[PDB]
């Protein structure tokens, strides 16, 4: 009946249409701050001197961008990893030129997104659930930390964190390849396996359940009306799905236990994406992909090119062109 | 890498739909697996919950109801229909792959989304105008000149040093 | 920017025609029950 205890009851109430919770108490303001700044910046921010060379990149719609080319541009290389809140700028005009808004958005988002993950634990506890859905979301979350925080920390500049835009994303991944040979890095290869495999097993599982729906409907109605929300009986025949899939391969490569099957569905893309987030996070400290350049030579010592040498020629063309005005000395050491 | 330098394939909306189809597939795979494993009914006494499924039981092994309240409260919307859910799991990655296939058919003919005409006209006229779109084409240009001679040896490309595009110092 | 003039009509119709189709079918669904 006391004031604080009634507040606590509302914060943690399972009856709000959207659950708040104590993680919600940080999530909501920070994601509103990041969302609102993002939307305004994407539409109307002026150009930002991402690379610290007084060469501003236009990122917003009103400065001549479309949905595909626009971005919130990363803050200036002149700032590096210095904190640049609004109140550290002489004026908003300066804060805008130097790329303040990127910092505001990524710090608020990474906070709110960390609280998002915690909110997933919390409501799981209030509802009597098992608790590890949040562990599955840690994979995407770790990935966002890598490209917005970890890689900047290791390279020493938020100017090298991933832009908040579609083509900025591509710019980031092209430059990454030239500087880290990420394609030839085993952790990125596990990401691809986690992501290709994830889409594969998604299609598989959906096609198998869908193949074994039990007839509950007529040809003039959606099969989906054969399941009623909250019915106790399962709505497909798992033995029939096992019987088809085990004959498509052989019996013992097929799951008859739905618990193992769904746990498999969870672990494969989660673990693959952990590794690829770990890839970005360790290439942040320049432990790069396998280098087999000139690894094959002949009896005399002529270099015999392989496909790795061809990859190198493409990486070289990325290297020498990117940030074409920013390097004064021969090696691009960060 | 070829497809980036020569076709600017990342700019292609059919590729982008494939990306969303594969990535959304992988998300669906993970979120559906985790949900089932974390709305399980207690059907056995042990801490390993796998043992308490029976492939021939009639009963659902996890609570669609609790799953739906959870995701409605966390994300605003949830699935309510197990049939739709598993069809959507088929639908998403299959469609995404079909879309990417179509875009590669276009590139068979060098029918790319290489450029935005409006950007190029403005940038040709206004040397202070720079976007991530123009930055990425410099990189494509690097890629082509630096890989072409070794990657297409039948063309006998000889690019003397002085014609190679290069930024400062590198 | 020097942009394809027809882009606008194309986008509007691209949105409008399929959306109106969906609304028509939804509203007459609700008038049944």
């Amino acid at each position: 009946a006391n004031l604080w205890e009634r507040f606590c009851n509302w914060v943690t109430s399972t009856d709000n249409r959207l659950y708040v919770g104590w993680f919600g108490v940080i999530m909501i303001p920070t994601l509103l701050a990041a969302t609102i700044c993002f939307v305004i910046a994407f539409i109307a921010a002026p150009p930002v001197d991402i690379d610290g060379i007084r060469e501003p990149v236009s990122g917003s719609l009103l400065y001549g961008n479309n949905i595909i080319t626009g971005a919130v541009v990363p803050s200036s290389n002149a700032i590096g990893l210095h904190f640049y809140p609004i109140w550290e700028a002489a004026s908003l005009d300066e804060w805008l030129y130097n790329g303040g808004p990127y910092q505001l958005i990524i710090f608020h988002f990474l906070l709110g997104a960390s609280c998002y993950m915690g909110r997933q634990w919390e409501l799981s506890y209030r509802l009597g659930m098992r608790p590890w859905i949040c562990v599955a979301y840690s994979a995407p979350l770790a990935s966002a930390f890598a490209v917005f925080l970890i890689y900047p920390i290791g390279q020493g500049s938020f100017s090298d964190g991933m832009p908040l835009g579609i083509s900025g994303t591509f710019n980031f991944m092209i430059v990454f390849q030239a500087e880290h040979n990420i394609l030839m890095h085993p952790f990125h290869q596990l990401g691809v396996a986690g992501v290709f495999g994830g889409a594969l097993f998604c299609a598989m599982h959906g096609s198998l359940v869908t193949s074994s729906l039990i007839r509950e409907t007529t040809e003039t109605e959606s099969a989906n009306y054969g399941y009623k929300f909250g019915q106790e009986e399962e709505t497909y025949n798992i033995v029939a799905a096992h019987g088809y899939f085990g004959r498509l391969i052989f019996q013992y490569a097929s799951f008859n236990n739905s618990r193992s099957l769904h746990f498999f569905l969870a672990a494969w893309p989660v673990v693959g994406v952990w590794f690829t987030a770990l890839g970005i996070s360790t290439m942040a400290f320049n432990l790069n992909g396998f280098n087999f350049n000139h690894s094959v030579i002949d009896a005399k010592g002529n270099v015999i090119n392989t496909w790795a040498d061809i990859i190198n020629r493409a990486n070289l063309g990325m290297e020498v062109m990117h940030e074409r005005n920013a390097h004064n000395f021969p090696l691009d050491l960060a | 890498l070829f497809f980036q330098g020569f076709h600017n394939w990342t700019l292609n909306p059919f590729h982008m739909m494939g990306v969303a189809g594969v990535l959304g597939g992988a998300l669906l795979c993970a979120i559906h697996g985790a949900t089932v494993e974390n709305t399980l009914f207690q059907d056995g006494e042990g801490a390993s919950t796998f043992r308490a499924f029976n492939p021939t039981q009639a009963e659902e092994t996890y609570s669609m109801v609790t799953a739906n309240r959870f995701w409605s409260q966390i994300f605003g919307i949830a699935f309510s229909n197990k049939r739709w859910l598993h069809f959507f799991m088929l639908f998403v990655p299959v469609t995404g792959l079909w879309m990417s296939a179509i875009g590669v058919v276009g590139l068979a003919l060098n029918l790319r989304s290489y450029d935005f005409i409006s950007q190029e006209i403005r940038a040709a006229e206004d040397p202070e105008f720079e976007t991530f779109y123009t930055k990425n084409l410099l990189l494509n240009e690097g890629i082509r000149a630096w890989m072409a001679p070794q990657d297409q040896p039948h063309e006998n490309f000889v690019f003397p040093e002085e014609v190679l595009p290069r930024g400062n110092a590198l | 920017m020097e942009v394809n003039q027809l882009g606008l009509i194309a986008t509007a119709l691209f949105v409008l025609v399929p959306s109106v189709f969906l609304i028509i079918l939804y509203v007459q669904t609700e008038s049944q029950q």
Binding site: L62, I67, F229, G230, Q231 | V65, S72, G76 | -
Partner: peptide, 30 residues
Amino acid sequence: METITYVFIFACIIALFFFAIFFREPPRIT
């Protein structure tokens, strides 16, 4: 005009979100 078009569509999606959440078909049991 292209700016207005982009923001308009984006604005429609946000509005749709609102209705999809708060004016959904309410799931009913059995």
